[PDB]
Amino acid sequence: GTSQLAELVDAAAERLEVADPVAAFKWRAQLPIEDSGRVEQQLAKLGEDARSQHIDPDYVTRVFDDQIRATEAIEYSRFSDWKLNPASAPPEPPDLSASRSAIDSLNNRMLSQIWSHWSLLSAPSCAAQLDRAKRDIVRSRHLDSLYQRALTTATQSYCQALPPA
Amino acid sequence: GTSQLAELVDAAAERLEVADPVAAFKWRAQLPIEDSGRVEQQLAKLGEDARSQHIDPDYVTRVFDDQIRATEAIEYSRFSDWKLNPASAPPEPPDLSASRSAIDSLNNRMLSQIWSHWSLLSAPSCAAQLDRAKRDIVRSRHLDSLYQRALTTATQSYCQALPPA
Ligand SMILES: N[C@@H](Cc1c[nH]c2ccccc12)C(=O)O
Ligand SMILES: N[C@@H](Cc1c[nH]c2ccccc12)C(=O)O
Numbered sequence: 001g002t003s004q005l006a007e008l009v010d011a012a013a014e015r016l017e018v019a020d021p022v023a024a025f026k027w028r029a030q031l032p033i034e035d036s037g038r039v040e041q042q043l044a045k046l047g048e049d050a051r052s053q054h055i056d057p058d059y060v061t062r063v064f065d066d067q068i069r070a071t072e073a074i075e076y077s078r079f080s081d082w083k084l085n086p087a088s089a090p091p092e093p094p095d096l097s098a099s100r101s102a103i104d105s106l107n108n109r110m111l112s113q114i115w116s117h118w119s120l121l122s123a124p125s126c127a128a129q130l131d132r133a134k135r136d137i138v139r140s141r142h143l144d145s146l147y148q149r150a151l152t153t154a155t156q157s158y159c160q161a162l163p164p165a
Numbered sequence: 166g167t168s169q170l171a172e173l174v175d176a177a178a179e180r181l182e183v184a185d186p187v188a189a190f191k192w193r194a195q196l197p198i199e200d201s202g203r204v205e206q207q208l209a210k211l212g213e214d215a216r217s218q219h220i221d222p223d224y225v226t227r228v229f230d231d232q233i234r235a236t237e238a239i240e241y242s243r244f245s246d247w248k249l250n251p252a253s254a255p256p257e258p259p260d261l262s263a264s265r266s267a268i269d270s271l272n273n274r275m276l277s278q279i280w281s282h283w284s285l286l287s288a289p290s291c292a293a294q295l296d297r298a299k300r301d302i303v304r305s306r307h308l309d310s311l312y313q314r315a316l317t318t319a320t321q322s323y324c325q326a327l328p329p330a
Contacts, residue, residue, distance in 0.1 A: 073248035076241050083238035084318045153249045 003133035004120050008113035009155060012067060013137050015106040016150050019074035024093035026075070027082055031096075033075045039068055046107065055115050062157050063114070064107075070154035077146055114161075121161035130158055168298035169285050173278035174320060177232060178302050180271040181315050184239035189258035191240070192247055196261075198240045204233055211272065220280050227322050228279070229272075235319035242311055279326075286326035295323055 003009075026033060043061055050060035082089040120126055134155065138148055168174075191198060208226055215225035247254040285291055299320065303313055 069248050073245045076245035076248060080238045080241035080245060083234050083241060084314050149249050 003129045003136060004117055005113075005126075005129050005133040005158070006136055008110060008117065008158075009130065009133040009137050009151070010140070011106050011109040011113065012154050013141055013143065013147070013151055015067065015103060015110070016070060016074060016147060016154060017141070018099050018102055018106070019071045019150075020078065021090075021094045022071075022096065022099050023075040023078040024090040025096045025099065027079065027089050028091070028093060029096070033072055033079065042068065046111075049107070049111060053111055053115055055111060055118075056161075059157075059161055060111065060114070062160075066157050067154040070150040073153065074146060074150055118161060119163075121158055122163045126159035126161070130155060168294045168301060169282055170278075170291075170294050170298040170323070171301055173275060173282065173323075174295065174298040174302050174316070175305070176271050176274040176278065177319050178306055178308065178312070178316055180232065180268060180275070181235060181239060181312060181319060182306070183264050183267055183271070184236045184315075185243065186255075186259045187236075187261065187264050188240040188243040189255040190261045190264065192244065192254050193256070193258060194261070198237055198244065207233065211276075214272070214276060218276055218280055220276060220283075221326075224322075224326055225276065225279070227325075231322050232319040235315040238318065239311060239315055283326060284328075286323055287328045291324035291326070295320060 023033070025031070043064060046060050046064050047057040050057040114121065120129060134151060137143070138151065141147075143151060188198070190196070208229060211225050211229050212222040215222040279286065285294060299316060302308070303316065306312075308316060
């Protein structure tokens with residue numbers, strides 16, 4: 001009763017959820033949500049990680065850009081909420097450096113699954129296995145409407161993996 | 166069948182709605198939503214306008230800060246939406262300079278009503294007359310859930326006007 005893509009999508013969902021403590025920290029520290037210099041660095045490092053792990057870097061780049069976009073979308077929604085209702089901004093978020101550490105371990109989890117399941121990601125049955133995984137994770141993580149939209153954005157390029165050679 | 170605060174709240178609502186073309190323009194031009202230097206200038210000019218029009222500048226400052234916060238909240242929500250779904254970002258928004266001109270005429274409308282209705286704003290019956298106005302405007306302008314929350318934020322300090330002297 002389980003999708004081969006469950007572990008990948010669970011990681012990706014877990015990494016989206018880090019958006020909440022990140023947004024809370026940045027609100028309190030007056031940091032921007034999007035720093036395009038930083039994102040560029042993050043993607044370039046992921047590309048390098050992909051090559052060293054024998055994964056198509058162009059795939060990783062696109063996929064992680066979807067994931068980062070999704071993450072920003074959540075952060076923006078939180079900022080909207082806290083502008084309307086500043087008393088609801090969490091007053092003691094976890095350290096940004098702890099959130100980044102969580103992110104970096106999740107990046108690795110996702111890369112390791114992308115490599116392992118490359119035949120699935122690149123096969124015609126991917127779209128179905130991904131829908132199944134998404135539904136399962138939305139339920140297991142109790143993802144609300146916002147996180148649901150985000151998870152769809154973050155996974156929208158998964159099934160465009162191409163077979164090698 | 167009409168609140169004395171209807172004209173003020175209608176102006177304020179109209180000015181919130183300018184958030185949409187502003188957010189669409191800034192998305193396309195890669196401009197930030199919040200520039201705190203700019204906001205500070207905007208508030209300082211409003212304070213000066215208030216003095217010249219014999220309105221309590223401290224009131225105007227707080228009220229317009231609520232209105233600007235509300236406006237940002239809408240812009241942030243749009244940015245969240247367009248991160249998830251970039252195809253829905255309006256591709257040909259009106260000129261930012263036209264939006265600013267609309268804003269400046271609405272500022273004046275709001276200031277003129279604040280002066281005219283100062284006895285009401287500062288009286289115990291304000292809270293009731295404001296609730297009535299809000300409900301009427303939400304209906305007449307067909308304001309959705311987001312704009313409803315925003316209009317509440319933008320008007321939250323209206324009834325704290327104090328009688329002179
Ligand atoms: N779009 C801006 C929004 C923002 C959030 N926090 C900020 C702090 C400073 C300047 C801008 C911001 C950004 O991504 O940065
Ligand atoms: N919080 C940021 C968000 C933002 C929107 N557009 C931007 C463009 C550049 C930098 C930041 C932004 C701000 O208010 O600016």
